[PDB]
DNA sequence: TATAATGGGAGCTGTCACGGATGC
DNA sequence: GCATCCGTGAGTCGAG
């Protein structure tokens, strides 16, 4: 159908590789495409070249490193839970530097993951995403102290665990004081230590304010550097011998050292800016010729007396600024890591460098890359910023890879965290989402990467810009860091233009942030664009600009819990960035150049490109993912179609021809309807479910493992126990459920035999033995069965038997077996829907049609919203997008209407009349006048002032529609709602939040070991937790019968619960309960404190709740 | 797929002839209000009954005058009127004029009334006006046989230059609500079950009234017999 | 954590009684159940326990009588419905519940400004009292039609919200 | 709400001493099987099954009902507690 | 991510 | 007409008069009809039922010329930054006043049944603040530091925002969110704390003999110190209705006698007596000076307040008083 | 996990006792033979 | 069971808050 | 008597 765009905004630059982030940050540290000669000196390669050379005798350097193929593609990773990875190698040599004998080896190294095409990890066959950690850049800051106004602290700030901060402070007394590890001590011996003498700090500083005789002090200048230095490591290391190199060697490790201390490139760049000196290296001082040279500390002190003093050109900075905040991506933190696991490696070299044959040794005898792999490993399944990928849609995928976390290793702990790190800041203008961010306690340390937004070589947020020069706009793009951002004055991207020239006197533009009027001749840049500030989800909220930021927030956090639907349509209202999130998150698949399709088929596409050679493209079909969600290609394109490069062969799991589809495009009307919608719940038509609006597929995997025992071996077989054919109709014949058989809950998916635990038994199984006359069996059944709640068709089933080619499980097991069960989910009651302007609501009452309330031609809604929930919600994005869609109903057509710039009142209006047109006038050629109940709700209307009296009905019913608002009429009566209701289109998901995944019940189960409590979570099938708070609500209504049986009889007393239960199957009132398991823990727990805890009656005579078990 | 439906049973619940209450359940998905509603049309509108549409009082030129000698005043008198309730023996029968003529201390009931062959007044102790000492009451009332509600402006009939139009209400029946619950019939989760309840004022009980309006909607689908 | 109860997502029941709530049938199932072992060998549904708890054990041997027989064992009795957080003692409430198809709880509307709970998929949890004393602490103090007013103001903590006022006030 | 629970309320000294009452005589009829109750055959709380009414299983129901007709007995230290269990035991064996 | 249930 | 306050007074009176069945069957009803006839009483929202006055134009040129003169003022140096900087804010915020009242104003008199208007007024949805942010200015804008900016958004929701618009509100609804964030966590240790402290207190007996007690005053100093002057209805109200008196009070020529439960209607009597200036302190049995050990006696604390009567003994007023205070506690702002 | 001494579990209601007053005057004869 | 070998190694840092002692 | 150090706490479901 015919899309219409609005909106008058041009975009010079579209937007950049959405996972670029991901993708060239683990490509630039990992530099397997570089030839190992032409490698820069960054990410794994620059952790080499700290932690070689390693001496100490015999050396062993290194030359260059190599990353071989993966063992294994990236399916069979999934499949085989294995890592997606490559082989490290590097070559070593050994030097014995008497001897001269040189002995050169490659070395294997183990594996490093490789990074897929879309951004992301496998680690043991689950997909994994590595989220970027925005922190504190390294350099040297200057703040107010809290305590002292009129005073400043000095911070120099290395990258996390390249050694320690160090603050410069003047102290009240006067002396200038240096913290390092927590210790206070004078400046003045450091700076005699870096060899500094009076005369020089005396010419250096001398202008300032007196604060040079702080650092004034006879006895530290009475003794030369090594005195000095010996007197610092006596107050640094308190009964520690002051031996002279160990002072050296603690002194150099401290600050020269480039191994132990670092600052980061971004570091020492903007050190080398503020200071405005220029720094050899990456080191606060150096190691030269003997002595110790200072890189830094002079014009540090120098900037602090000089910013206390008052003098002209030194400020204090902002720490939550995006100039000083930096981003770590996957790249940075992955070399971090090797770089420690080398570290050990090199520890493990030194000792294995003593111990041995000092004659012959191989660089392999002397390497264990054990601690290497293991910290790699580490890194990947135990880290923080190593999260689960969200594969629920493409969105999902995608925003995850742009997510940005202030937590994390080295970030911050939660309640270390105030308003400010929290808050917006004026930088994060173009660079951090101010709309994108979690509810609740994540709130602020949790962001989303701008669309335009990108992170430079250093780390920083760089967003584009427009050069204005003379009032006239160029096409060329430039991307500033906040930093350089300040600097400008950066007009806005909606003002008018002729041509490449500013069109208003008055231009509305930013200097630092601040907002304001500026002339065109003062403009010296432009916004490119007003997606610039958002996040790629927030960008897929049209009318965004009418909608309350805090909705905003919902809308765009919901649409990543979208469930892919069969059906799933595009929105009726797009943004227009719909087709570029299908096409980056690698959902669709492509033509990759001119050709013609040779095959179709639902499993593959060939494809005859104009080289002429014949490329096949397999289809991902109903593939499970991590959220099980399915997710499937299927092809969109014919045989013998011609199609250019970059057209769309096959669509991917929740898009339509393109076309991001996270849910369905229904028909609403806005009324309260019978107290069903009340409180945001939501009413929808039988209909929806009729033609399977609303339908998903989710797929769940089921795993049992027969392993060997010292009781006699598990194993699956279709012999099992005291069980009819019936239990096995439709299991096959080794005992594994058979594709396409519909399994429900007690169903058996894999059966299988345990032998049992030795058995004695009680004289009423001998004695029914005896009567029944048969032998206990040898077996017993541990099979595997359909889970409570759960069920479907199994359409995929995995065996893996130990002593099977290319099959080596874990050492006991046996077998292993898996069992995929597919199931079909129609929307029903109690499943969350939600549009992307924040209204969400779980589907309440499911109406049949004849119930649905409809409009004259007989058309019934699909779905009826309250009105209530928009005032206080604020979000009138929803009401123009009903409108909008109520226009493209009857028109047949779609819109675009970007964030911003889009669609006007008085152009919908324009749409709406030429609907109307379509909607009215074809019922005047059909032979019908208006309704008579047409005509009493134009009464109500016309006493609502919506109409002007006097015209005629098809007027009045043109003006009611031009405000979107149409004659209803209720189902059940046939009778019309007395005013005129707002029906129109709206694009409305389903998300992932569904009452068959919830709804849980317990009537008894298992319980937890030293607790004797019930287990919480539904796959342990346990009960609900009843905590303090239940425990208080219990006490205020004095029911103390309640609160004591949930204490004793439903949990935690053995005896009781037990008692209880019998009581109940038999029909009698359940017994006094008695003490609680937990209680006895407790007391024993305290035994083990050496506590005594004395239960006692009136009389003061010990009680024993143990019954005497646990006396002599 | 494969349904079997038995039943309703109609249940009937009633106190004297001025009210009643019925049941009719179980009912298939949506039958609830779809007899409902009609009948509740049916019954307020369509039910034949009896109303006092003219009044004319000596001496008094309009509604809003007052009567010399009676403490009630002309509008308070037609109410009053209003709730009279008229029964017609004679199905042959379309319209009386009821003459009442009383003085002196005394109060005036609808028992005071001529009574006219055929013509039965259902409530007789309905009181209409309290005349005191020298205070006269003449008055000649309009009572027409008719359906539903119609105000004193519609019908506009006059018998004499100063007779009053009252607003005529022929529905016997007063109200009419229903409601429909949800029931089960066995493993039937969503059956229907119609509730209805009709005041009338006697001349008709609901039983009666409820037939009449099942009768009517019945012949009105005939109406789709012959094109 | 306590036995004998279980969790949903709520939906609002406008039907209900201020002293009812929609309880999901399989979700009474599994909390009455032991109740409802001893009402299906009361009645000629099972010869006895055992053999009733193997019969529930599979959903596909599961008949309509015994829904019936839970309908007959629930019979006057209450539930205890609570919301997260609780804030205060009207955090848990009484309810007769009232068997319905679907995996929804039905909560009365009059209820959920006590709870602080609306229908944008906050959950419930379902709590089983068993003894009579406990059943009868229920419905006697804890009943929600037993509380119409905040134990903190003295002003009425059910009363018309939303929708209600907006069909009265027009 | 409970059928009657205003003059419940109005029987007690204490809104929980209703509640104790309530439950030990449901306790009691649950005890004797019904043999006990001081309600007519009329006034008998009704269930209404698939087959037709038959008398109400929840004990708590005819406490209550019980205790609204002031046949019931209520207070400290009436008996020994003994007593008035093989007394309740001489008069309806269980 | 917690409050109302965006995430 | 029926809105939220009339419909809590009668569920309220209904409760007293009628007990508690049939004021559920009250309540009952109402939600009944209540629905029913919401459903086809025709409200909805369309873009055009937020209505902006035209009104609201007048009022800001009218600020745009102050303005003007304010930087007049500040360009001869009659006025400092942070004095025009306050002058300013001043201008905006009654402005803001200004153009509410509008969009009330025209409401209340040209479209009294506008759907906005209905839901505010009779107290189902929204605010005049919420309302005034959809038909007239969204208002002045917070930066990170709490700072304010000396431009407001002039954009309403129904006109729409633009991008410097939104960003500068996105600081405000961020400091907003967290500050929803970290508030609960407190509210809940708090709730929790007090919890701890009156844990043990519950109703141990009937009376506990005291003769103290404390005197709850009618009226409070004034911040003119002119003279004292009476208490809001509601803080009277919350120190008075359910306590027993501990003393004989006679007022208006009527007697309330010493152990009497305070109906609310005794308590207006007292405000009346106290407006006719026979009574400024009322003598009342407190929980502060009740002798009861591990707790209170029912005369001391007199009503319980979901029961509207006096508290049974054996009810936990620790629990009920710690609920009370910290269910609130996360709407503190 | 004891009878909380609140509500029904407080010493002043929980000691009451209920009896119908057939058993009543029953136990009231065997107090009277003796 | 025997050449002699003789004081370790990581630390990682944006809360606050009273409050309770301890120390100057 | 005041300055400063240490130890302890920091809201509930639900799933991981
Ligand atoms: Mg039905
Ligand atoms: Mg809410
Ligand atoms: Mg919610
Ligand atoms: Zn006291």
């Known amino acids: ?1112 | 797929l494969d349904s079997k439906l038995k039943a309703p049973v109609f249940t009937v619940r009633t106190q004297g002839r001025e009210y009643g209450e019925f049941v009719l359940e179980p009912l298939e998905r949506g039958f609830g209000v779809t007899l409902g509603n009609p009948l509740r049309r049916i019954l307020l509108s369509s039910i034949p009954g009896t109303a006092v549409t003219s009044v004319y009082i000596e001496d008094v030129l309009h509604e809003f005058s007052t009567i010399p000698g009676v403490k009630e005043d002309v509008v308070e008198i037609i109410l009053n009127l209003k709730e009279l309730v008229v029964r017609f023996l004679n199905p042959s029968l379309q319209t009386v004029t009821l003459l009442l003529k009383a003085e002196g201390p005394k109060e005036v009931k609808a028992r005071d009334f001529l009574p006219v062959a055929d013509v039965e007044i259902m409530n007789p102790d309905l009181h209409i006006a309290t005349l005191e000492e020298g205070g006269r009451l003449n008055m000649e009332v309009r009572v027409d046989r008719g359906v539903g509600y119609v105000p004193a402006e519609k019908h506009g009939i006059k018998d004499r230059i100063n007779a009053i139009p009252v607003d005529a209400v022929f529905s016997p029946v007063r109200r009419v609500a229903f409601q429909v619950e949800d029931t089960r019939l066995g493993q039937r989760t969503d059956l229907d079950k119609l509730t209805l309840r009709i005041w009338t004022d006697g001349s008709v009980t609901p039983l009666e009234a409820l037939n009449q309006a099942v009768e009517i909607l019945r012949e009105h689908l005939t109406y789709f017999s012959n094109p | 954590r306590v036995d004998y109860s279980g969790r949903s997502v709520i939906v609002v029941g406008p039907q209900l009684k201020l002293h009812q709530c929609g309880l999901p049938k399989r979700m009474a199932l599994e909390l009455f159940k032991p109740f409802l072992l001893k009402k299906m060998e009361e009645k000629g549904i099972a010869p006895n326990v055992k053999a009733a708890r193997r019969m529930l054990e599979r959903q596909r041997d599961i008949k309509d009588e015994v829904w019936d027989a839970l309908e007959e064992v629930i019979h006057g009795k209450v539930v205890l419905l609570n919301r997260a957080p609780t804030l205060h003692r009207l955090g848990i409430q009484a309810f007769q519940p009232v068997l319905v198809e679907g995996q929804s709880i039905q909560l009365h509307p009059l209820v959920c400004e006590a709870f602080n709970a609306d229908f944008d998929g906050d959950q419930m949890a379902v709590h089983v009292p068993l003894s009579s004393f406990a059943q009868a602490e229920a419905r006697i103090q804890m009943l929600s039609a037993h509380n119409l007013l905040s134990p903190a103001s003295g002003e009425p903590l059910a009363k018309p919200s939303r929708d209600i006022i907006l069909g009265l006030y027009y | 709400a409970e059928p009657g629970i205003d003059k419940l309320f109005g029987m007690v000294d204490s809104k929980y001493r209703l509640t104790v009452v309530v439950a030990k005589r449901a306790q009691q009829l649950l005890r004797h099987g019904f043999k006990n109750t001081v309600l007519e055959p009329e006034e008998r709380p009704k269930m209404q099954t698939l087959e037709g009414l038959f008398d109400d299983p929840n004990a708590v129901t005819w406490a209550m009902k019980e205790l609204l007709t002031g046949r019931l007995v209520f207070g400290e230290n009436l008996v020994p507690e003994d007593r008035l269990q093989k007394e309740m035991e001489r008069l309806y064996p269980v | 991510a917690x409050x109302x249930x965006x995430g | 007409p029926q809105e939220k306050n009339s419909l809590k007074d009668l569920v309220y009176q209904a409760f007293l008069r009628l007990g508690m069945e049939k004021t559920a069957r009250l309540l009952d009803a109402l939600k009944y009809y209540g629905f029913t006839f919401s459903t086809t009483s025709g409200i909805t929202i369309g873009i055009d039922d937020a209505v902006i006055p035209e009104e609201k134009k007048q009022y800001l040129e009218e600020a745009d010329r102050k303005l003007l003169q304010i930087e007049q003022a500040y360009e001869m140096g009659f006025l400092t930054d942070r004095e025009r900087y306050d002058q300013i804010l001043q201008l905006w915020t009654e402005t803001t006043e200004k153009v509410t009242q509008a969009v009330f104003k025209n409401f209340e008199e040209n479209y009294p049944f506008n759907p906005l208007y209905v839901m505010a007024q009779s107290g189902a949805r929204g605010n005049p603040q919420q309302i005034r942010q959809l038909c007239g200015l969204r208002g002045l804008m917070q930066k990170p530091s709490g700072e304010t900016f000396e431009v407001p958004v002039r954009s309403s929701f129904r006109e729409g925002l633009t991008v410097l618009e939104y960003f500068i509100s996105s600081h405000g609804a961020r400091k907003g969110g967290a500050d929803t964030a970290l508030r609960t966590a407190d509210s809940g240790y708090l709730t929790r704390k007090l919890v701890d402290v009156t844990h043990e207190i519950v109703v141990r007996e009937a009376d506990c003999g005291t003769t103290n007690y404390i005197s709850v005053p009618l009226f409070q100093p004034d911040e003119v110190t002119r003279s004292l002057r009476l208490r809001k209805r509601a803080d009277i109200e919350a120190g008075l209705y359910g306590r027993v008196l501990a003393r004989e009070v006679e007022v208006l020529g009527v007697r309330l006698e010493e152990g009497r439960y305070l109906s609310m209607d005794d308590v207006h009597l007292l405000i009346k007596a106290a407006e006719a200036g026979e009574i400024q302190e009322v003598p009342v049995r407190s929980p502060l000076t009740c002798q009861t050990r591990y707790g209170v006696c029912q005369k001391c604390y007199g009503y319980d307040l979901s029961m509207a009567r006096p508290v049974s003994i054996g009810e936990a007023v620790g629990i009920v008083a710690a609920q009370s205070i910290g269910e609130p506690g996360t709407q503190l702002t | 996990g004891r009878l909380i001494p609140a509500g029904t579990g407080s010493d002043f209601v929980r000691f009451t006792q209920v009896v119908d007053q057939k058993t009543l005057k029953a136990i009231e004869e065997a107090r009277k033979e003796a």
């Open chain 1, 1 to 1112: 159908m015919e899309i219409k765009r609005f909106g008058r905004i041009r975009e010079v630059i579209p937007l950049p590789p959405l996972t670029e982030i991901q993708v060239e940050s683990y490509r630039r540290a990992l530099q397997a495409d570089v030839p190992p000669e032409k490698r820069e000196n960054v990410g794994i390669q620059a952790a080499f070249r700290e932690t070689f050379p390693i001496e100490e005798g015999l050396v062993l350097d290194f030359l260059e490193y190599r990353l071989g193929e993966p063992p294994f593609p990236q399916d069979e990773c999934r499949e085989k839970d294995l890592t997606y990875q490559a082989p490290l190698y590097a070559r070593l040599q050994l030097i014995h530097k008497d001897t001269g004998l040189i002995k050169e080896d490659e070395v294997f190294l183990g594996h490093i993951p490789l990074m897929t095409e879309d951004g992301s990890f496998i680690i043991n066959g689950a997909d994994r995403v590595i989220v970027s950690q925005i922190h504190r850049s390294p350099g040297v800051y200057f703040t107010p102290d809290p305590a002292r106004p009129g005073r400043y602290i000095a911070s120099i700030i290395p990258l996390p665990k390249r050694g320690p901060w160090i603050d410069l402070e003047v102290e009240p007394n006067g002396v200038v004081s240096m913290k390092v590890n927590k210790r206070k001590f004078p400046l003045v011996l450091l700076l005699r230590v870096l060899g500094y003498d009076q005369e020089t700090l005396a010419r250096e500083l001398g202008a300032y304010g007196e604060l040079v005789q702080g650092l004034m002090d006879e006895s530290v200048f009475a003794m030369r550097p090594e005195e000095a230095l010996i007197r610092l490591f006596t107050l640094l290391r308190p009964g520690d011998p002051p031996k002279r190199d160990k002072a050296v060697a603690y002194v150099y490790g401290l600050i020269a050292d480039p191994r132990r201390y670092d600052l980061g490139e971004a570091g020492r760049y903007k050190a080398e800016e503020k200071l405005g000196i220029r720094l050899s290296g990456r080191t606060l001082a150096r190691f030269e010729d003997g002595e110790f040279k200072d890189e830094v500390f002079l014009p540090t002190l120098r900037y602090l007396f000089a910013l206390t003093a008052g003098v002209p050109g030194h400020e204090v900075d902002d720490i939550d600024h995006l100039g000083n905040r930096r981003i770590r991506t996957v790249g940075e933190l992955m070399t971090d890591q090797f770089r420690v696991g080398l570290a050990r490696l090199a520890r493990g070299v030194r000792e294995r460098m003593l111990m041995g044959s000092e004659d012959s040794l191989t660089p392999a005898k002397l390497v264990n890359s054990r601690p290497l792999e293991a910290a790699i490993r580490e890194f990947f399944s135990r880290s923080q910023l190593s999260q689960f990928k969200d594969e629920t849609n493409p969105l999902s995928s995608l925003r995850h890879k742009r997510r940005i976390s202030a937590l994390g290793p080295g970030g911050l702990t939660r309640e270390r965290a105030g308003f400010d790190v929290r808050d917006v800041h004026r930088t994060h203008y173009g660079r951090i989402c101010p709309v994108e961010t979690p509810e609740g306690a994540n709130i602020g340390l949790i962001t989303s990467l701008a669309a335009y937004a990108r992170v430079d070589e250093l780390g920083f947020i760089r967003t584009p810009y427009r050069r204005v020069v003379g009032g006239v706009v160029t096409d060329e793009v430039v991307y500033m860091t906040a930093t350089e951002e300040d600097r400008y004055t950066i007009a806005q991207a909606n003002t008018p233009l002729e041509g490449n020239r500013i069109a208003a006197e008055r231009v509305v533009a930013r200097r630092k942030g601040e907002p304001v009027i500026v002339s065109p001749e003062e403009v010296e840049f432009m916004d490119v664009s007003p997606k610039q500030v958002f996040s790629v989800n927030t960008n897929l909220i049209p009318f965004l600009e009418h909608d309350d930021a805090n909705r905003a927030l919902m809308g765009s956090n919901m649409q990543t819990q979208a469930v892919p639907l069969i059906r799933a349509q595009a929105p009726v209202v797009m943004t227009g960035l719909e087709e570029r999130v299908v096409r980056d998150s690698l959902a669709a698949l492509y033509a990759e150049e001119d050709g013609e399709v040779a095959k179709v088929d639902g499993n593959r596409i060939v494809v005859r490109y104009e080289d002429g050679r014949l490329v096949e493209y397999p289809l991902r079909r109903f593939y499970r993912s991590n959220q099980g969600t399915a997710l499937d290609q299927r092809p969109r394109v014919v045989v013998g179609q011609r199609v250019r490069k970059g057209d769309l062969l096959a669509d991917g799991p929740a898009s339509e021809n393109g076309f991001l589809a996270l849910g369905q495009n229904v028909l609403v009307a806005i009324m309260p309807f019978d107290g069903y919608n009340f409180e945001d719940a939501i009413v929808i038509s039988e209909e929806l479910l009729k033609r399977d609006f609303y339908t998903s597929i989710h797929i769940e995997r089921y795993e049992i493992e027969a392993r060997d025992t010292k009781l006699g071996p598990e194993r699956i077989t279709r012999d099992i126990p005291h069980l009819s054919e019936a239990a096995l109709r439709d299991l096959d014949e080794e005992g594994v459920v058979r594709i396409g058989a519909e399994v429900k809950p007690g169903d058996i998916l894999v059966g299988r035999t345990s032998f049992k635990g030795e058995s004695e038994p009680t004289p009423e199984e001998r004695l029914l033995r005896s009567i029944f006359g048969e032998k206990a069996r040898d077996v017993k059944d541990t099979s595997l069965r359909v889970p409570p709640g759960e069920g479907g068709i199994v359409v995929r089933t995995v065996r893996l038997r130990r002593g099977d080619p290319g099959v080596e499980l874990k050492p006991g097991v046996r077998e292993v077996v898996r069992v995929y069960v597919a199931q079909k989910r129609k929307l029903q009651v109690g499943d969350k829907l939600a549009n992307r302007h924040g209204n969400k609501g779980v589907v309440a009452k499911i109406l049949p049609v004849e119930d649905m309330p409809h409009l004259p031609d007989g058309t019934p809604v699909d779905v009826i919203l309250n009105p209530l929930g928009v005032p206080s919600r604020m979000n009138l994005g929803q009401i123009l997008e009903t409108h909008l869609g109520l226009a493209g109903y009857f028109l047949g057509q779609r819109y675009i209407s970007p964030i911003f710039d889009g669609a006007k009142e008085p152009e919908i209006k324009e749409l709406l009349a030429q609907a109307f047109e379509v909607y009215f006038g074809k019922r005047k050629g059909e032979g019908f006048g208006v309704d008579k109940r047409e005509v009493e709700v134009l009464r109500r209307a016309e006493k609502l002032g919506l109409v002007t009296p006097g015209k005629t009905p098809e007027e009045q019913l043109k003006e009611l529609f031009l405000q979107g608002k149409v004659v209803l009429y209720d189902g059940r009566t046939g009778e019309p709602i007395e005013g005129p209701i707002v029906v129109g289109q709206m694009f409305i998901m389903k998300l992932y939040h569904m009452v068959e995944d919830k709804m849980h019940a317990r009537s008894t189960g298992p319980y937890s070991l030293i607790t004797q409590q019930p287990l919480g979570g539904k796959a342990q099938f346990g009960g609900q937790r009843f905590g303090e708070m239940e425990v208080w609500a219990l006490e205020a209504y004095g029911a103390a019968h309640t609160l004591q049986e949930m204490l004793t009889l439903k949990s935690d007393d053995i005896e009781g619960r037990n008692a209880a239960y019998e009581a109940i199957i038999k029909g009698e009132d359940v017994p006094e309960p008695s003490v609680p398991e937990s209680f006895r823990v407790l007391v024993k727990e305290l035994q083990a404190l050496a506590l005594d805890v004395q239960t006692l009656d009136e009389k003061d005579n010990p009680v024993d709740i143990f019954e005497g078990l646990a006396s002599k």
